[PDB]
Amino acid sequence: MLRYHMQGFSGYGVQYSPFFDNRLAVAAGSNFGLVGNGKLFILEIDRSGRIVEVNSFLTQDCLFDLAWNESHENQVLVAQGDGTLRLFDTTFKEFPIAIFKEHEREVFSCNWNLVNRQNFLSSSWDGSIKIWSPLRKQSLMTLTPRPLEITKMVDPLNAIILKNCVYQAQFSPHDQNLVLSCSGNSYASLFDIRLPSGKNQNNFLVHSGLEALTCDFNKYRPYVVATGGVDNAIRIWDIRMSCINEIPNAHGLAIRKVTWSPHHSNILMSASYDMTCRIWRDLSNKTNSTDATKGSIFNFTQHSEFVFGADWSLWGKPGYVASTAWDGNLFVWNGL
Amino acid sequence: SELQRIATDIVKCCTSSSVESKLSESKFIQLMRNISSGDVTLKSELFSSNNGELVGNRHIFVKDEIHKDILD
Amino acid sequence: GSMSQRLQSIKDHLVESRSKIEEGKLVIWINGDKGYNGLAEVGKKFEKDTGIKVTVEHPDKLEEKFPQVAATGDGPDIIFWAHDRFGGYAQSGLLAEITPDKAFQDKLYPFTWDAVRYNGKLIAYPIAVEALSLIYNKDLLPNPPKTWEEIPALDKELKAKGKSALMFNLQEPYFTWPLIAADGGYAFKYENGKYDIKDVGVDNAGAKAGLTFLVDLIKNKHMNADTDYSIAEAAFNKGETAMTINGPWAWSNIDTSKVNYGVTVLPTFKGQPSKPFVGVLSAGINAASPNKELAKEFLENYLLTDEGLEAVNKDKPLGAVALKSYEEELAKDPRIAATMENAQKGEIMPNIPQMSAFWYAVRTAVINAASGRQTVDEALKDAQTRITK
Ligand SMILES: [Mg+2]
Ligand SMILES: [Mg+2]
Ligand SMILES: [Mg+2]
Ligand SMILES: [Mg+2]
Ligand SMILES: [Mg+2]
Ligand SMILES: [Mg+2]
C-alpha cells in the first residue's frame, strides 16, 4: 500500500484530480478537526509509488471537504469550519483565489457539478445547501431540506420556544438540475432546482431516525442512489420508485462516507467510525440481506482512527482507492 | 466543563474484537480520557496541565487574504 | 463553544451507533393516534409488580423506522401496528415467534390469530379489530335496509323528501370493495399459510356482479360518481343522507354533529354479506430484543386482560378488541358489536406487498366504471391484467 502522513492533522476528505492521473488532494484539520488550523494537501504519486507533497495551504479553521474544479486543472475548493468555502489555485502559495462567505455554521461538504462543470455545491450545519459560481461572490441558489413529516410535527414558532445538519449534498452526474442531500434528521432530500422554493423537494426516510451522514449517485444508473449513516446500514434506493437493496450492519459504528465506483454500476465503497473501509457488490443489480457475506468484497483495515475520506481512482488499474482518516494517514490501495 | 462532560460520555460509551482493540489503542480516545480527567483543556489550541505545555498542533493565524486576478 | 459543539456531534454519532436495546426494561413503540398514555399506565402497573421499567414512545413514522433500525439490535422491544405491515417485518426476520399456549390462544377470537401468522409462525399478539360498518340516521331511517337491493326504492322515497339514501366514498376502493367482494371478488387467494400472487379475484363473476350493482346505482342517480370521503362525511353529518359507510375513526365527528345515528351490519348483496377488509392492531416482539420473556409476560398477563385493555381504551377507544372477555364488555355498545360482526363477515387485509398493486389497479377500475370512462367488464379486465402482469 502507498502512504503519506500529515503530521498532527486528521483527514476529512480526499479526492483524485480529474485532470492529473497521479494527483490528489486531502482536506484536513488539527486536533481531529475539533479546533485549530485546517490544511489542504496537494499530493503527487510518482512512478515508484512514493506519495509526495507538492503544495499545501494552511487555513484558519479545520477543513471538512474538498472538490477539484471540473473546469480548471489548477483549482480546488475546500469547505471550512468557519462557514466559508475557499477556492485555491495550486500554482500559488499560502492564500486562496476566492472566498465564499454565506453559511452561518461549519461547511461539511462541497461538490463540483460534473454535468455543466461550471458550478459547485456546499452543505452546512446551518441546515442549508448553496449553489455557487466560482466567478461570483454571492450564491446563485439556496436549498433547505424540509421533509413533510419533519415539517408537519415541528411547531412553526419552534425557534422562540426553548425545549438540521446537512452532512452531504451532491449534484446528479446525470441530470444537471437534480441535487441529493442527507441530513441529521435521517432524511435524504431530492431537489429539482427548476421548481420554486417550497415545491422543489421530495424527502424520504433513510437511516432509522438516526443521522444520515452520506449519500452518492450511482455513476451509471440515473435513478439509483446510496446512503449511509448512524444506524450502521448502507441503503440503495431507486428515486423513480423505494429501498431496492439494503446492507444492514455494514459496519460496527457510524458510516461517514459511501461512494459508488466510477468503473462499475454494481460496486460501492464505504468508510466508517469503525476504522475500516469496505468494498461492496450491489446484488440487486436478489438482495445483500439474503447473501451469506452481504455482498462484501474487501475489508481495508490499516487505518488506526476513524475513516472520514474515501475516493475511487478515475484512471489506471480499475479498483484503486484513496482513503484518509483521523490517524493523519492517506493510503492508496487496490480493493479489486 | 461542557467539553469535560461530552468527553466523559465518549469514554463511557465506547472504550468486533479488532474494532474494540483499535478503540482501546486510539489517540482520539486517549485525548477524550485526558479531557475527561481535566488534564487537557482549551488554551485554538489544547494544552496539558501536567506537562504545562501544548498538546496537538499549534494554531497559526491565517489572514483572509486572497491573491489578485493575475493568473489564468 | 465551537470545539464542544463539534465534539458533541462526534459523541452523538458514536453513542447512537453503538447503542443496543437495554436488558431488563421494556421500550414500546405505538402510533400517536392510539391510547399511549393508557398503555403507559399498564406499564406503571407492570413496573410496580416486577420492577421492570416500561417506556412507551410514539415516534413519527415508527412503521418505517422499525424495519430500518431492527437489524442493529436497537429500537423497541415491542412494536404496535396494523397487522398488514407485520408480513414484511416477518419476511425480513425482524419479529420473534410468539409462544402463547393453547389456553391463552382460546382467550382471543380465532380469526384474529390468522392476521398475525406468517410462514406458519405466530409473529404478534392481536389487540384490536377494525372494519367498516353501515352508519345510518335514526330520524330519517329507523330501520335500515338489510340488503343492497333495497337501496334504489329507499332512495326514491328519500329523494322526494329532499334527502338521499346513501352517500359514501366512491374514490377509494377500500370503501367500495366490501360490495365487490360479496358475491365472489377477492384480492389474492390464500392457501397453505401463503397468498398466491398469481391467483387474483378482480375480474371474476362475483366482482363483476358487485361493481355492476354499484355502477347501476350511479346510472340510476341513486349515487354520484364524484362522491368522496369529505362529500359523504359532510352529507351524513349534516343530516342530508340516511346512510353512509365508514369506520370507527369517523364516529367522534358524528358525535359532535348531534345527528341521531346507529351503526349496523353492512347490507347483504345477492344474499351474501358485504366483506370489508379487517385491520388488526397487533403487538410484535423485536427478534433482537434481550427481553422477550419480559415482553411476553407484559403482553399476556398485563395488557391482554380486561384491566389492561380498559386502561388503553379509556385514554383513546380501541374500537372492537381481539380479547373475548373485554369485547363482550364493550359490545353492549351496538356500534362495537357491529364493528366485530362486520369484521367476522369480512376478510383479513392481506399482509403482502402486492396489495399496493391491487389497490392502485382497483382504484382506477372503479373510478373508470363509475365515471363511464370504461364498462365494468373492461375496467375489471384491465385491473386484473395489471395486477397479474
Ligand atoms: Mg467533495
Ligand atoms: Mg435503544
Ligand atoms: Mg404516520
Ligand atoms: Mg363467498
Ligand atoms: Mg374532494
Ligand atoms: Mg366481563
Cell 449517485 sits at which residue?
A217
Technique of determination: X-ray
| Cβ C81 vs Cβ C124: under 8 Å | no
Q: Where are the beta strands (DSSP E) in chain B?
A: 40-42, 46-48, 54-55
| Cβ C233 vs Cβ C244: under 8 Å | yes
Residues 6+ apart with CB under 8 A from A293: none
Sorted by where each begins, the domain ranges of chain A are 1-334
Phi-psi map region of A133: left, alpha, beta (phi>0 left; psi -120 to 50 alpha): beta
| Cβ A128 vs Cβ A186: under 8 Å | no
List helix spans (H) across chain C. 2-18, 36-50, 62-69, 86-91, 102-105, 110-114, 151-160, 173-182, 205-219, 229-237, 251-257, 292-298, 306-315, 324-330, 334-345, 355-371, 376-387
DSSP state letter for C97? P
Contact A254 C3 (CB under 8 A): no
- 3-state class of C54 per DSSP? strand
Residues 6+ apart with CB under 8 A from B3: B35, B41, B42, C3, C4, C7
Reading the block at residue A248, the C-alpha cell is 444492514
> In angstroms, rounded to a whole number, what is the distance separating the alpha carbons of residues A22 and C213?
75
Nearest-by-Cβ selection for A248 from C60, C71, C75:
C71
Reading the block at residue A179, the C-alpha cell is 441535487
Q: What is the DSSP annotation of C282-337?
A: EEEEBTT-TTHHHHHHHIIIIISSHHHHHHHHHHS---EESBHHHHHHHTTSHHHH
* CA-based end-to-end distance of chain C: 60
> In angstroms, rounded to a whole number, what is the distance separating the alpha carbons of residues A235 and C142?
57
Cβ–Cβ contacts within 10 Å for residue C44, how many? 13
Find residue C54's DSSP bridge partners: C26
> Which residues 92-151 in chain A show a CB within 8 A of chain C?
106, 149
* Sheet of strand B54-55: strand arrangement: B40-42, B46-48, B54-55
> In angstroms, rounded to a whole number, what is the distance separating the alpha carbons of residues C203 and A253?
51
| C-alpha of C115 from chain center | 11
| Cβ A37 vs Cβ B62: under 8 Å | yes
Cβ–Cβ contacts within 10 Å for residue A250, how many? 24
Pairing of strands A187-192, A166-171: unpaired
Maximum distance among all alpha carbons in chain C?
78
Q: For testing the chain A interface, which of C3, C6, C63 should be mutated: the one with the most A CBs within 10 Å?
A: C6
What Rg value do the Cα atoms of chain C yield, rounded?
A: 23
Listed residue (A46, A44, A41) closest to A7, CA to CA: A41
What is the CATH architecture of B1-72? Helix non-globular (6.10)
Distance (Å) from the alpha carbon of C11 to chain B's nearest alpha carbon? 6
Listed residue (C34, C97, C27, C111) closest to C69, CA to CA: C27
| Cβ C205 vs Cβ C183: under 8 Å | yes
> In angstroms, rounded to a whole number, what is the distance separating the alpha carbons of residues A209 and C57?
13
Residues 6+ apart with CB under 8 A from C275: C177, C178, C181, C182, C345, C346, C347
Find residue C280's DSSP bridge partners: C129
- Taken in order C97, C99, C102, C107, the sign of the CA dihedral is negative
Distance (Å) from the alpha carbon of A7 to chain C's nearest alpha carbon? 20
| Cβ A108 vs Cβ A66: under 8 Å | no
Give the CATH fold of the C1-389 domain. D-Maltodextrin-Binding Protein; domain 2 (3.40.190)
Listed residue (C81, C75, C76) closest to C126, CA to CA: C81
Reading the block at residue C44, the C-alpha cell is 406503571
User: What protein residues have CB closer than 5 angstroms to ion ligand 1?
Assistant: A 65, 67, 111
Angle between helices B27-37 and B2-13 in degrees, nearest 10: 130
> In angstroms, rounded to a whole number, what is the distance separating the alpha carbons of residues C80 and C103?
23
| Cβ A30 vs Cβ A9: under 8 Å | yes
Give CA separation, C35 vs C42, C43, C115, C295, C316, in Å: 11, 12, 22, 19, 4
Contact A208 C69 (CB under 8 A): yes
Superfamily, domain A1-334: YVTN repeat-like/Quinoprotein amine dehydrogenase (2.130.10.10)
DSSP state letter for A40? E
C332–chain B Cβ distance below 8 A for any pair? no
Contact A96 B66 (CB under 8 A): yes
B5–chain A Cβ distance below 8 A for any pair? no
| C-alpha of A162 from chain center | 33
Listed residue (C45, C387, C331) closest to C186, CA to CA: C387
Angle at C202 between CA C201 and CA C207, to 5 degrees: 95
Tell me how long chain C is.
389
DSSP state letter for C115? T
> In angstroms, rounded to a whole number, what is the distance separating the alpha carbons of residues C329 and C309?
11
Cβ–Cβ contacts within 10 Å for residue A80, how many? 27
Residues of C in contact with A81 (CB under 8 A): 2, 6
Residues 6+ apart with CB under 8 A from B31: A31, A32, B7, B40, B46, B55, B56
Tell me how long chain A is.
336
Resolution, given in Å to one decimal, reads: 1.8
Residue A314 one-letter amino acid: L
Chain A interface residues facing chain B, Cβ-Cβ under 8 Å? 8-9, 30-32, 35-37, 58-61, 89, 91-92, 94-99, 252-253, 274-276, 301, 304-306, 326-327
Nearest-by-Cβ selection for A273 from C17, C72, C75:
C17
> In angstroms, rounded to a whole number, what is the distance separating the alpha carbons of residues C346 and C194?
18
Backbone phi and psi for residue C22, each to the nearest 5 degrees, phi listed first = -85, 130
Residue A312 one-letter amino acid: W
Backbone phi and psi for residue A111, each to the nearest 5 degrees, phi listed first = -150, 145
Residues of B in contact with C6 (CB under 8 A): none
CA of A323 to the centre of ligand 5 (A): 55
Listed residue (A299, A258, A256) closest to A277, CA to CA: A299
> In angstroms, rounded to a whole number, what is the distance separating the alpha carbons of residues C27 and C54?
6
Contact B42 C15 (CB under 8 A): no
Residues of B in contact with A9 (CB under 8 A): 57
> In angstroms, rounded to a whole number, what is the distance separating the alpha carbons of residues A275 and A307?
5
